[PDB]
Amino acid sequence: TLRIAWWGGQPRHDYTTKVIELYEKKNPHVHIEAEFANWDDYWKKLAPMSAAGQLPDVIQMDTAYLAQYGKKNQLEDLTPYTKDGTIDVSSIDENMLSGGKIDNKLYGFTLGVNVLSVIANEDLLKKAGVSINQENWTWEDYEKLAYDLQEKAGVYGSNGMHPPDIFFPYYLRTKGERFYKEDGTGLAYQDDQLFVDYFERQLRLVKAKTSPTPDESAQIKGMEDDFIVKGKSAITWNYSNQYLGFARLTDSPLSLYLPPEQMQEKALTLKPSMLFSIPKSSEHKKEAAKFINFFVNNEEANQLIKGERGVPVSDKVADAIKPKLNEEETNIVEYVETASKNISKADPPEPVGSAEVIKLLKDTSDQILYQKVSPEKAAKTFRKKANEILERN
Numbered sequence: 057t058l059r060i061a062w063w064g065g066q067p068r069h070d071y072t073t074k075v076i077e078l079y080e081k082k083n084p085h086v087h088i089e090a091e092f093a094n095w096d097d098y099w100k101k102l103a104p105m106s107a108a109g110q111l112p113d114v115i116q117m118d119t120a121y122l123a124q125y126g127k128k129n130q131l132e133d134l135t136p137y138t139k140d141g142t143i144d145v146s147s148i149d150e151n152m153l154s155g156g157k158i159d160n161k162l163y164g165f166t167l168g169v170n171v172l173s174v175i176a177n178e179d180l181l182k183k184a185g186v187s188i189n190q191e192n193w194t195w196e197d198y199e200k201l202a203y204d205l206q207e208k209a210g211v212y213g214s215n216g217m218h219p220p221d222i223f224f225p226y227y228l229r230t231k232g233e234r235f236y237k238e239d240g241t242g243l244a245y246q247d248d249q250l251f252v253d254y255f256e257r258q259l260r261l262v263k264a265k266t267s268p269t270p271d272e273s274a275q276i277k278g279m280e281d282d283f284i285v286k287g288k289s290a291i292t293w294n295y296s297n298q299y300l301g302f303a304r305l306t307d308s309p310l311s312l313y314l315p316p317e318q319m320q321e322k323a324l325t326l327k328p329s330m331l332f333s334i335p336k337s338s339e340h341k342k343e344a345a346k347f348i349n350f351f352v353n354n355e356e357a358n359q360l361i362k363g364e365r366g367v368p369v370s371d372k373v374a375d376a377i378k379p380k381l382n383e384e385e386t387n388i389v390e391y392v393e394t395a396s397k398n399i400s401k402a403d404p405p406e407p408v409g410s411a412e413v414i415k416l417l418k419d420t421s422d423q424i425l426y427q428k429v430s431p432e433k434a435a436k437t438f439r440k441k442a443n444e445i446l447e448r449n
């Protein structure tokens with residue numbers, strides 16, 4: 057019994073089932089049991105599963121949790137499988153796979169590459185009479201756009217920039233700063249005004265009713281109820297590949313735009329979108345590795361995936377599936393190519409303590425948006441606690 061688990065929304069679950077069925081057709085001795093959840097529920101269910109020694113054989117993994125699992129003896133080093141050809145890396149440049157490495161070991165195999173984007177509903181932009189001039193626009197331009205969208209189109213100008221552990225670090229990079237120290241022992245940025253400026257802007261957007269309160273965001277059941285899909289927001293902040301799921305769930309014309317203020321500091325990164333990992337507890341490690349190889353290198357399988365989990369890490373596969381892509385699937389490839397004319401290498405995997413820092417920043421953001429703590433005070437409390445968490449590693 058080969059257990060395979062991932063996070064995502066309905067569009068991802070639909071074709072992943074077909075990829076699994078295709079693997080079983082080609083390998084009829086294999087019976088796969090699939091397990092899936094949305095992002096939040098996925099990590100919540102995975103943690104006590106790992107404590108019980110019951111992780112699935114193939115785990116969809118994120119860089120933000122790679123060290124949390126890999127430095128706590130949960131994950132198998134995949135390097136033997138790349139060395140003996142079980143997972144073929146001949147068409148994968150090793151620089152893409154390094155997003156799954158912790159020090160010397162390969163704890164996750166990168167499945168794709170993506171780039172942060174501002175995704176917009178073109179019909180709602182037109183309703184408000186507004187446009188995005190993506191090459192050069194500023195955070196101030198974005199805030200004005202969000203007010204224009206609420207005042208003139210009656211919709212949000214932000215989906216919430218959720219979660220803060222993605223978009224506050226993006227803001228830091230637009231200002232030439234960094235969230236984590238390279239050694240992982242504390243926060244890199246030293247000027248609390250950066251935190252204050254970011255969360256003051258979030259508070260203004262919420263108070264102007266152009267961005268959701270935490271209680272509204274918590275109501276979102278699954279991807280079909282996300283703001284961009286229901287038309288409650290004209291704007292959503294997501295990775296390039298996530299455009300595809302949205303485009304399959306709404307008829308509205310959606311576009312990918314470069315986020316504000318990426319130009320000067322090359323704030324965007326070519327990020328490992330997600331990974332597959334194998335737990336040390338697995339009784340089917342070789343079969344799990346063979347499934348990973350199939351997922352990344354099989355062209356037929358990738359004609360079902362169509363970049364929904366990121367641009368394929370195999371250049372051979374990524375170019376071979378381009379003729380199969382339709383307009384919306386091609387829009388993502390075009391966006392990544394455009395962003396890549398001014399982009400940075402991804403930062404290494406997040407340090408141990410990332411999982412606790414993520415929740416700390418979400419909790420702190422909630423308190424700011426409910427006006428229970430000022431951004432000035434929260435900057436200080438966040439730094440103190442984040443550094444207490446990180447100094448353990």
Ligand SMILES: C[C@@H]1O[C@@H](O)[C@H](O[C@H]2OC(C(=O)O)=C[C@H](O)[C@H]2O)[C@H](O)[C@H]1O[C@@H]1O[C@H](CO)[C@H](O)[C@H](O)[C@H]1O
Binds near residue numbers: 170293
């Ligand atoms: C922007 C959010 O970043 C991460 O919290 C997480 O991204 C991971 O998943 C995916 C993916 O599922 O394709 C790509 C990234 O490379 C991963 O690190 C979230 O999934 C991601 O976006 C969330 O998307 C949902 C979509 O319904 C909501 O819009 C939610 O508010 C976003 O946080």
